[PDB]
């Protein structure tokens, strides 16, 4: 038993590391829904949102912040599957990733490349979700295909990695139970401290607004440089309050922070909202998605779009 | 008195973190904000200036927008010494002075790396291609970053040229930051014998003139057979000829070689990828590979029959 | 027992001492100083080869096993991945 | 045994330059040692 106890204690040890996650009011965990085109990223997110917030987002665009627990929130981002640059930057910020694999077809380039990019910029928590399994006509080939895929997913990701299997889509929704099963896993995930993420400040644009005066757009022309405000939640190390901080935007260039101000939380977590062993109350569950259509209203630029004797 | 060393280090980290939280509780909310800044989890407004006109116009909500703070080293530009390899699943080895779309930190850019070898650690010698199945030292110009930062490289990012092959071309880690390199290329001079007297021999075509021979008097020279020799003196007549004494008699068909080295420089090329600023956002194109360039102009790969 | 009853040991890579050594694939090239996570006692270990020295870098977790005299230990995994597996390019080291 | 197959690849031999085709086959250390040893045999016997 002493030899056994020595070995188990051996595995427990790790390299000491500092996790800069704040002790109060942590940001939501960034969930990157990455997969080849047409695997079912959108239907997954819609299924993943519904189990939490009880409301379908008919259209999803940009990050989607949803409450998942009494003191837990998640930000869902689909990776643009046809852009490589989009896979690179999401890999550097996604705390959790949902990996869509077409079971009938098998693995693709766009999948493993993200794994190698993720392997090369800091492996985050990696979860495989298998889809299009209803296309199989025989159970024997389905089980064999499942075995081959899960074992190969164990080569890229630690052996015994959790891999989910989804059969089909009904009303743009996956089966509830398998969609419910993944709920418990994501809720209990703890995330290892990453060197890159815990040393620099970063924040994902929840919404986009141009603050340039329309008159300047006319008297000089559209060519004129634009004053812009970008909103979102901060991650990593704290951002210094004084303006002038140097910051990079992927695919854009390096800019300096002209102004910084804190706003109250658009999606207050349940333990926080009520503050201002018990199950999450369904009122507390909330969804905040500026760019996406939540309910029936979609806002783009300055025009807003909604879906819907006396008549005379 | 802690049982294992590990928890001691954990105890020190926790003690500092516990120390940190105590005083921020002591600082006022505004005073805390002035000191720590905006902690993670805060919903904040960032206002930017001189943002290019194409960003707001060519805004696709489907494409994410990511902001990342830059440390002082990230701002500085210079030569980055990197240990790099062709990705195992990449079909083809990389080439020196060949564009490579490279991701350091929060930024992606295209550069012209120089792949090099230590020559068993006498000198940094330029290498023409990446080793097939091992790392190699790589030098390129660009923004600096702290050492030990992993990175990745790609040759093609546009959808049009994606094809079926693996696009991850190179993988590596940065080891040093400085603003030059002293890469060198090995340059050998080849001369030919025309008169032989046992060990002593007269060589020709090594040098155009005795101007050159005088500088290289006494220099080490060898033949393809491995017989070592020296440049003893330049013959007055004809111009360029010199006498050499060799370890053993050389034959007329022998080729004598003088080994020498010529410095090489790193090209200062930078082309950041700005896909979001483009309407397509998926057809970003930069410097082309040497192979595609020859195809466009319809040129065969250079070759030498003697080689 | 070298590890006090255990078959393997964790450590943190401090420095590759022979990195400056001239002769390729040398025994001095081959040594890396590792600090055991159990007790803070700094020790040295053997790698598989100068190619496999190249995967290992400072501040990464390494699994040690019993093996220039004075060095009794061999590194078998780095960051939870087998060095031999990396050497055969059968796996990629996680950062 | 830790040497890969690729590490043990053949390094091929070059030949005489075409311009120098008239001067004879381009010799190598392996060919040179044959002439060197045989010349030494000549000198040793001539010496005795």
């Amino acid at each position: 038993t002493m030899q056994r106890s020595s070995d188990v204690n051996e595995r427990k040890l790790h390299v000491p590391m500092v996790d800069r996650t704040p002790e109060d009011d942590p940001p939501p965990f960034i969930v990157a829904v990455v997969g080849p085109p047409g695997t079912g990223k959108t239907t997954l997110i819609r299924s993943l949102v519904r189990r939490m917030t009880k409301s379908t987002l008919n259209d999803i665009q940009g990050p989607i912040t949803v409450v998942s627990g009494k003191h837990r929130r998640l930000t869902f981002l689909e990776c643009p599957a046809d852009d490589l640059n989009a896979m690179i930057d999401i890999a550097k910020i996604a705390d959790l990733v949902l990996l869509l694999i077409d079971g009938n077809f098998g693995f693709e380039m766009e999948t493993m490349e993200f794994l190698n990019i993720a392997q090369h910029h800091g492996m985050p928590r990696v979860l495989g979700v298998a889809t299009h399994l209803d296309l199989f006509k025989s159970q024997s080939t389905l089980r064999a295909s499942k075995k081959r895929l899960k074992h190969r997913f164990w080569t890229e990701v630690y052996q015994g990695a959790k891999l989910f299997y989804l059969s089909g889509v009904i009303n743009g929704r996956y089966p509830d139970r398998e969609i419910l099963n993944l709920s418990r896993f994501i809720s209990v995930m703890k995330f290892r401290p990453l060197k890159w993420r815990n040393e620099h400040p970063y924040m994902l644009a929840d919404r986009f607004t141009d603050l340039t005066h329309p008159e300047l757009i006319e008297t000089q022309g559209l060519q004129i440089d634009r004053k812009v405000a970008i909103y979102g939640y901060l991650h990593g190390t704290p951002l210094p309050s004084a303006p002038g901080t140097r910051v990079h935007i992927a695919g854009v260039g390096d800019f300096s922070v002209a102004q910084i101000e804190k706003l109250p939380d658009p999606c207050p977590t349940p333990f926080y909202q009520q503050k201002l062993r018990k199950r999450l109350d369904d009122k507390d569950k909330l969804i905040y998605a500026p760019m996406s259509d939540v309910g029936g209203v979609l806002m783009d630029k300055d025009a807003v779009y909604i879906d819907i004797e006396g008549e005379k | 008195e802690y049982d294992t060393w590990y928890e001691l280090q954990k105890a020190k980290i926790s003690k500092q973190l516990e120390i940190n939280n105590i005083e921020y509780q002591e600082m006022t909310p505004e005073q805390r904000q002035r000191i720590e800044g905006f902690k993670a989890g805060s919903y904040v407004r960032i206002v930017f200036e001189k943002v290019p006109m194409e960003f707001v116009k060519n805004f696709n909500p489907k494409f994410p927008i990511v902001m990342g703070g830059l440390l002082p080293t990230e701002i500085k530009f210079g030569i980055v010494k990197a240990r790099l390899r062709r990705h195992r699943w990449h079909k083809k080895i990389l080439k020196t002075n060949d564009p490579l779309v490279l991701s350091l930190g929060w930024r992606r850019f295209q550069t012209l790396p120089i792949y090099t070898t230590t020559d068993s650690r006498t000198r940094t010698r330029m290498l023409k291609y990446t080793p097939e199945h091992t790392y190699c030292n790589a030098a390129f110009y660009g923004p600096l970053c702290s050492p030990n930062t992993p990175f990745c490289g790609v040759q093609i990012v546009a959808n049009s040229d994606t094809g079926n092959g693996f696009r991850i071309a190179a993988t590596g880690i940065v080891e040093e930051i400085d603003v030059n390199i002293e890469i060198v290329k090995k340059l050998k001079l080849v001369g030919f014998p025309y008169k032989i007297f046992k060990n002593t021999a007269f060589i020709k075509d090594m040098f155009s003139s005795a101007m050159e021979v005088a500088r290289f008097e006494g220099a080490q020279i060898k033949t393809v057979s491995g017989i070592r020799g020296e440049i003893k003196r330049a013959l007055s007549k004809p111009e360029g000829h010199y006498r050499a004494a060799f370890e053993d008699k050389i034959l007329m068909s022998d080729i004598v070689i003088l080994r020498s080295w010529y410095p090489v420089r790193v090209k200062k090329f930078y082309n950041p990828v700005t896909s979001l600023l483009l309407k397509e956002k998926t057809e970003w194109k930069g410097l082309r590979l040497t192979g595609q360039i020859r195809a466009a102009m319809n040129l065969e790969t250079p070759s030498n029959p003697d080689s | 027992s070298p590890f006090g009853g255990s078959s393997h040991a964790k450590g943190i890579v401090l420095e590759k001492l022979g990195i400056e050594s001239k002769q390729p694939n040398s025994a001095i090239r081959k040594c890396v100083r590792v600090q055991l996570i159990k007790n803070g006692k700094k020790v040295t270990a053997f790698v598989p080869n100068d190619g496999c020295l190249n995967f290992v870098d400072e501040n990464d977790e390494v699994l040690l096993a019993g093996f220039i005299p004075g060095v009794r230990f061999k590194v078998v995994k780095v960051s939870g991945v087998s060095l031999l597996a990396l050497w055969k390019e059968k796996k990629e080291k996680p950062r | 045994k830790l040497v890969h197959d690729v590490q043990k690849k053949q390094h091929r031999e070059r030949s005489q330059l075409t311009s120098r085709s008239r001067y004879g086959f381009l010799e190598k250390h392996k060919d040179y040692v044959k002439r060197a040893q045989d010349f030494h045999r000549k000198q040793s016997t001539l010496k005795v």
Binding site: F105, F107, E108 | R88, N164 | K88, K90 | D5
Partner: peptide, 25 residues
């Protein structure tokens, strides 16, 4: 749009020594 994995990625045989065919059976 869909691009499948090649033989090298489907096996990850890596770099192995050449082995004689009598070894198969």
């Amino acid at each position: 749009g869909k691009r499948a994995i090649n033989y090298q990625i489907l096996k990850n045989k890596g770099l192995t020594p050449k082995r004689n065919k009598d070894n198969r059976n």
